[PDB]
Design a protein around this motif. Structure first.
Motif, PDB file in Angstrom:
ATOM      1  N   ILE A 147       0.712  -1.281   0.000  1.00 55.76           N
ATOM      2  CA  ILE A 147       0.000   0.000   0.000  1.00 55.76           C
ATOM      3  C   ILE A 147       0.753   1.355   0.000  1.00 55.76           C
ATOM      4  O   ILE A 147       1.790   1.523   0.631  1.00 55.76           O
ATOM      5  N   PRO A 155      -2.789   6.290  -0.361  1.00 58.14           N
ATOM      6  CA  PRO A 155      -3.910   5.409  -0.663  1.00 58.14           C
ATOM      7  C   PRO A 155      -5.257   6.107  -0.605  1.00 58.14           C
ATOM      8  O   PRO A 155      -5.913   6.158   0.439  1.00 58.14           O
ATOM      9  N   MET A 195      -3.560  -1.933  -5.021  1.00 61.05           N
ATOM     10  CA  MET A 195      -3.260  -2.244  -3.630  1.00 61.05           C
ATOM     11  C   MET A 195      -4.131  -3.421  -3.212  1.00 61.05           C
ATOM     12  O   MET A 195      -5.206  -3.605  -3.790  1.00 61.05           O
ATOM     13  N   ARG A 207      -7.427  -6.331   1.103  1.00 62.42           N
ATOM     14  CA  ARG A 207      -7.704  -6.221   2.516  1.00 62.42           C
ATOM     15  C   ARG A 207      -7.535  -4.813   3.024  1.00 62.42           C
ATOM     16  O   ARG A 207      -8.162  -4.461   4.026  1.00 62.42           O
ATOM     17  N   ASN A 208      -6.706  -4.004   2.375  1.00 62.20           N
ATOM     18  CA  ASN A 208      -6.420  -2.655   2.839  1.00 62.20           C
ATOM     19  C   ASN A 208      -7.247  -1.607   2.108  1.00 62.20           C
ATOM     20  O   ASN A 208      -6.722  -0.589   1.682  1.00 62.20           O
ATOM     21  N   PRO A 244     -11.337   0.428   2.188  1.00 58.12           N
ATOM     22  CA  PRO A 244     -12.580   0.531   2.961  1.00 58.12           C
ATOM     23  C   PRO A 244     -13.713  -0.224   2.298  1.00 58.12           C
ATOM     24  O   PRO A 244     -13.708  -0.435   1.086  1.00 58.12           O
ATOM     25  N   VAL A 245     -14.689  -0.634   3.104  1.00 62.13           N
ATOM     26  CA  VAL A 245     -15.866  -1.266   2.529  1.00 62.13           C
ATOM     27  C   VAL A 245     -16.721  -0.215   1.830  1.00 62.13           C
ATOM     28  O   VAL A 245     -16.629   0.987   2.094  1.00 62.13           O
ATOM     29  N   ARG A 272     -16.458  -8.098   4.867  1.00 64.42           N
ATOM     30  CA  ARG A 272     -15.099  -8.572   5.108  1.00 64.42           C
ATOM     31  C   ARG A 272     -15.094  -9.348   6.407  1.00 64.42           C
ATOM     32  O   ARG A 272     -15.550  -8.827   7.428  1.00 64.42           O
ATOM     33  N   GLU A 273     -14.601 -10.584   6.362  1.00 62.44           N
ATOM     34  CA  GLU A 273     -14.323 -11.380   7.557  1.00 62.44           C
ATOM     35  C   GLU A 273     -13.376 -12.500   7.163  1.00 62.44           C
ATOM     36  O   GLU A 273     -13.574 -13.143   6.129  1.00 62.44           O
ATOM     37  N   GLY A 274     -12.328 -12.704   7.953  1.00 58.42           N
ATOM     38  CA  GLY A 274     -11.445 -13.822   7.698  1.00 58.42           C
ATOM     39  C   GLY A 274     -10.583 -13.638   6.461  1.00 58.42           C
ATOM     40  O   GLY A 274     -10.172 -12.531   6.110  1.00 58.42           O
ATOM     41  N   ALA A 275     -10.334 -14.749   5.771  1.00 62.02           N
ATOM     42  CA  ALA A 275      -9.531 -14.755   4.557  1.00 62.02           C
ATOM     43  C   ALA A 275     -10.272 -14.209   3.359  1.00 62.02           C
ATOM     44  O   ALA A 275      -9.660 -14.005   2.312  1.00 62.02           O
ATOM     45  N   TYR A 276     -11.565 -13.977   3.480  1.00 65.31           N
ATOM     46  CA  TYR A 276     -12.423 -13.757   2.332  1.00 65.31           C
ATOM     47  C   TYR A 276     -13.021 -12.363   2.417  1.00 65.31           C
ATOM     48  O   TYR A 276     -13.509 -11.945   3.469  1.00 65.31           O
ATOM     49  N   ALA A 296      -8.209 -12.719   0.090  1.00 63.80           N
ATOM     50  CA  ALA A 296      -7.963 -11.329   0.460  1.00 63.80           C
ATOM     51  C   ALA A 296      -6.656 -10.786  -0.101  1.00 63.80           C
ATOM     52  O   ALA A 296      -6.462  -9.569  -0.146  1.00 63.80           O
ATOM     53  N   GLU A 297      -5.732 -11.651  -0.504  1.00 65.43           N
ATOM     54  CA  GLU A 297      -4.431 -11.138  -0.921  1.00 65.43           C
ATOM     55  C   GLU A 297      -4.378 -10.870  -2.417  1.00 65.43           C
ATOM     56  O   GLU A 297      -3.331 -10.487  -2.945  1.00 65.43           O
TER      57      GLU A 297
END
Lengths: 271, 147, 77
Positions: free
Chosen positions: A118, A121, A128, A131-132, A134-135, A165-169, A184-185
Motif C-alpha cells: 500500500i 492510498p 493495492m 484487505r487494505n 474501505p468497505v 469482510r471477515e477472515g480470509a475472504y 484477500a491477498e
RNA sequence: AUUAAAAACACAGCACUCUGCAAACACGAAAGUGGACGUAUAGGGUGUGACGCCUGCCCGGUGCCGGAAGGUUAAUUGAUG
RNA sequence: GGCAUGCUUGAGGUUCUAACUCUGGUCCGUAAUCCGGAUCGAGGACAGUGUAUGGUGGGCAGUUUGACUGGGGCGGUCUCC
C-alpha cells in the motif's frame, strides 16, 4: 457523441463516439506484436463457433495486468485507442523508463499514481491488496488467484463494489448481481474503467458489423428439417417444438451451471 | 497391521500393534518413519533394538522441555500498518508470518492450510491459524502494532 | 494406452444387453489412478499410474519387489 | 452453376434467456484446440425485422423455474418362514 | 425404566492436513515454459475417474403401419346360428 445527417441511406442512423483526448497516431513499438485471425476454427479445422470471419488487420498489445512493480511512482503519458478491446488503454512511464500499457481508469493525461503494497492510498488507478481498502468502495481489475492477473470487471465502464469482510475472504458484489467471496491477498484497483460512452452507439448499416468481424446469422425457421430442429414447414410456421438450440438444448430458460467445485465461494446467485 | 514407533499421537504406544485404515498407514505414518509393517523376517532385529527404542523414548520429550521456554514469550512485534486510524489497513501476512515465527521460534515452515479465517479485521491483537500439527491445529497469537 | 504398470490390465470388450436382448458393444476400462510411492533406498517419490488392484499388491510386497521386476521386464520405473 | 431473381434469405434496430472464467457452448475415444491471449457496456442461443403510433385478456394442457411436508420408487443389505 | 462407560455401527455437523487437484507464482533440465522435477500458495477428503444402478433422452439408429373394394381414398365388413 455526435449524430449524423441523413445524406445517404447508410448515414441516416449512424451515432458516433468521437474523442479528442486520444493520441493521434503511433503506438509504442516494443509493446506490440502479431495476431492472426482464426475464423472460428480449432486444430481439426472445423468451425466450432459460428458467425465469425473477415475484418481488419490488428496488432495485439501487451496490456499489463500484474502490476508487480512496487514503490515506483508512475507518470501517464497519453491515452490510446485499442482495437481488440472496448476500453481505452494508457501508456505509463515509471521513474526509470520501462514504459507499459495498462487499462485506463477515469483519470487521464498525466496524473501520477503509485502502484504498491500500500501507498498514497486512494485515487483512481492505485493498485493495492483487497484487505487494505474501505468497505463500500468501487474497484476494478480483480485477481482471483494471486499473481495471475486481473480477470473481473475489465470491460468498458465496468466496476464492482465491496460489501463485507471477515477472515480470509473479502466478499464483493459483481456487476452481474452475483456475490462472490474473494480471497484477500488478490490485488485490485480503485476506480472505474474509462470509456463509458459505449452503450450509446448505433452502427447504422449492414456493412458496419461486417468490417468488425461478425458474419450474418440465419434464423432456424427458415431452414429444412434436416438442418435445425425448428425445421421446415409450409408458409411461415410457428416452429411447433419448444424453442431449442441447433443441437437440442432448451433455450428460453434452463439453468446450465454444473461446475460443482466453486459453489462454496458463491454466496448469492444472480437474480 | 503396522507396528507403532511413536508415542505422541492420539492412539500411539511403545510397541503395541494397532489395526488402522489402509489410507491412514499408506499415506501418513510410513513415509515419515513413525511406523513399520509387521513382519516375521527381521523380528530378531526389532527385539535387539528394544533398548534403542526406549532410549529414543527418553530423548524426544527431553528436547521439548528445552523448547517451550522460547515459544510463549510473545516478544514478536509485527510491523503492520494502520497506526492510529481505526480501519483495517495493515499488512496481515500468510507467507511472511511463517518466517516471523521461525526467526525466533520453531524453524519449521510449511503452510498448506485450509482456512476461511485467514486475514484479520481492524487494528488489535487477533489470531492466525498456523501449521502446528498434522491432523489438528489451533490459532497462534499475533501482535499487530503501528509502523 | 490404459494399461497398468504392475498387473498388466488392458481394456476388454463385451456387450450391453437390454431387457429384450438388444446386443450392443461397450468397453470395460480398468480403474487406474495416479499415485506417488515413497522408496527408502533412492529416498524419493516415484509416480506411476496403477490400478486399485495394483494398490493391494504394493500393500503385499511393499515397494521394491514390485519395482525391481518392473525393471526386470524392462520399464521406466 | 444448366427452365424459378421474388413478396424469399440477409440487415441495422428490438426483446427474452442462459454464462463469474479451468465460463455457457462446440469439435474431439482421450491429450488438447476454438471461444479469447477476450472478462457480464462481454460471450452463446431463439424469435421479430429501419422510422412513427402501439402491443389487449387466458397459467386449465404441454415445457421450464421454485418448494419441500407427505405418499409411491433403483441396485445394496437379508431378519423370518 | 434407564444410570452411567465401554465395546463396536450407521446417519448428520464442524475442523485439520498427509492423499489427490491447480488451464497459480519463481528455480532447474534449457538457448524452449510443451513436458517433467524441486519449493512455497490455494482448494481438500470435496472435485474427478473406473465399475453396478435409477431418471431424462427423435440428439441418433434399426424398423413396423392388413385385406375385400363394379379404379382406391372415405365409410362398411372379417367368427358362429
Amino acid at each position: 457523441i455526435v449524430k449524423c445527417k441523413p445524406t445517404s441511406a447508410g448515414r441516416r442512423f449512424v451515432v458516433k463516439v468521437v474523442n479528442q483526448e486520444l493520441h493521434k497516431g503511433a503506438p509504442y513499438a516494443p509493446l506490440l506484436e502479431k495476431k492472426s485471425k482464426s475464423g472460428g476454427r480449432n486444430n481439426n479445422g472445423r468451425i466450432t463457433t459460428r458467425h465469425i470471419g473477415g475484418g481488419h488487420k490488428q496488432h495485439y498489445r501487451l496490456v499489463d495486468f500484474r502490476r508487480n512493480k512496487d514503490g515506483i511512482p508512475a507518470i501517464v503519458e497519453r491515452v490510446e485507442y485499442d482495437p481488440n478491446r472496448t476500453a481505452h488503454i494508457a501508456l505509463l512511464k515509471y521513474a526509470d523508463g520501462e514504459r507499459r500499457y495498462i487499462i485506463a481508469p477515469k483519470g487521464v493525461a498525466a496524473g501520477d499514481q503509485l502502484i504498491s503494497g500500500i501507498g498514497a492510498p486512494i485515487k483512481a488507478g492505485n493498485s493495492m491488496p483487497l484487505r487494505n481498502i474501505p468497505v463500500g468502495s468501487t474497484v476494478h481489475g480483480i485477481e482471483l488467484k494471486p499473481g495471475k492477473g486481473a480477470q473481473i470487471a475489465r470491460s468498458a465502464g465496468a466496476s464492482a463494489q465491496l460489501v463485507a469482510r471477515e477472515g480470509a475472504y473479502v466478499t464483493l458484489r459483481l456487476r452481474s448481481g452475483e456475490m462472490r467471496k474473494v480471497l484477500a491477498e488478490c490485488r485490485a484497483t480503485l476506480g472505474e474503467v474509462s470509456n463509458s460512452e459505449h452503450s450509446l452507439r448505433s452502427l447504422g448499416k449492414a456493412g458496419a458489423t461486417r468490417w468488425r468481424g461478425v458474419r450474418p446469422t440465419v434464423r432456424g425457421v427458415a431452414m429444412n428439417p434436416v438442418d435445425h430442429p425448428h425445421g421446415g414447414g409450409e408458409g411461415r410456421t410457428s416452429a411447433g417444438r419448444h424453442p431449442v438450440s441447433p443441437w437440442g438444448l432448451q433455450t428460453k430458460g434452463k439453468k446450465t451451471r454444473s461446475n460443482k467445485r466453486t459453489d462454496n465461494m458463491i454466496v448469492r446467485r444472480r437474480k | 497391521e503396522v507396528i507403532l514407533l511413536e508415542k505422541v499421537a492420539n492412539l500411539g504406544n511403545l510397541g503395541d500393534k494397532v489395526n488402522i485404515k489402509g489410507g491412514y498407514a499408506r499415506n501418513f505414518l510410513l513415509p515419515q518413519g513413525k511406523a513399520t509393517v509387521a513382519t516375521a523376517e527381521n523380528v530378531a532385529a526389532f527385539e535387539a533394538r528394544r533398548a534403542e527404542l526406549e532410549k529414543a523414548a527418553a530423548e524426544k520429550k527431553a528436547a521439548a522441555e528445552a523448547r517451550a521456554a522460547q515459544l510463549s514469550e510473545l516478544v514478536v512485534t509485527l510491523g503492520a500498518h494502520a497506526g492510529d486510524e481505526g480501519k483495517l489497513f495493515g499488512s496481515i501476512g500468510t507467507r511472511d508470518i511463517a518466517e516471523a515465527v521461525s526467526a525466533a521460534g520453531y524453524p519449521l515452515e510449511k503452510a498448506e492450510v485450509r482456512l476461511p479465517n485467514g486475514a484479520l479485521r481492524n487494528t488489535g491483537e487477533f489470531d492466525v491459524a498456523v501449521h502446528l500439527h498434522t491432523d489438528v491445529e489451533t490459532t497462534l497469537k499475533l501482535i499487530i502494532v503501528a509502523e | 494406452s490404459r494399461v497398468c504398470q504392475v498387473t498388466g490390465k488392458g481394456p476388454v470388450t463385451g456387450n450391453n444387453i437390454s431387457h429384450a436382448h438388444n446386443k450392443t458393444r461397450r468397453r470395460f476400462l480398468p480403474n487406474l489412478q495416479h499415485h506417488r510411492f515413497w522408496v527408502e533406498s533412492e529416498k524419493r517419490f516415484v509416480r506411476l499410474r496403477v490400478s486399485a488392484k495394483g494398490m493391494r499388491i504394493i500393500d503385499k510386497r511393499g515397494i521394491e519387489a514390485v519395482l525391481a521386476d518392473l525393471r526386470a521386464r524392462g520399464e521406466k520405473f
